[PDB]
């Protein structure tokens, strides 16, 4: 497992394309970490990261839409629990 915190601000966008969906047994796995962005500029948000919780939101029982909704309206610090699949 893993734990990454992406602070908002800076640039603005989060740069992060998650790929998966609770309708296919997939803990929302990142497939594209845009560069020059919070996720790719926090030395942790790297592709192959199955998120299971965003800001204390256990996404394990959430669909790909419930996971992107949190990343869309995150708080000052985007604490994202990740399951690296390297």
């Amino acid at each position: 497992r893993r734990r990454v915190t992406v602070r908002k601000a800076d640039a603005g966008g989060l740069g992060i394309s998650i790929k998966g969906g609770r309708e296919n047994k997939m803990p929302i796995l990142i497939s594209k970490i845009f560069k020059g962005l919070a996720a790719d500029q926090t030395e942790a948000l790297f592709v192959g990261d199955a998120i299971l919780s965003v800001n204390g939101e256990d996404l394990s029982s959430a669909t790909h839409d419930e996971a992107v909704q949190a990343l869309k309206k995150t708080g000052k610090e985007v604490v994202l629990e990740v399951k690296y699949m390297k």
Binding site: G13, L14, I16, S17, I18, K19, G20, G21, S31, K32, F34, H64, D65, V68, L71, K72
Partner: peptide
């Protein structure tokens, strides 16, 4: 599903 936040 491939979104982009």
């Amino acid at each position: 599903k491939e979104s982009l936040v």
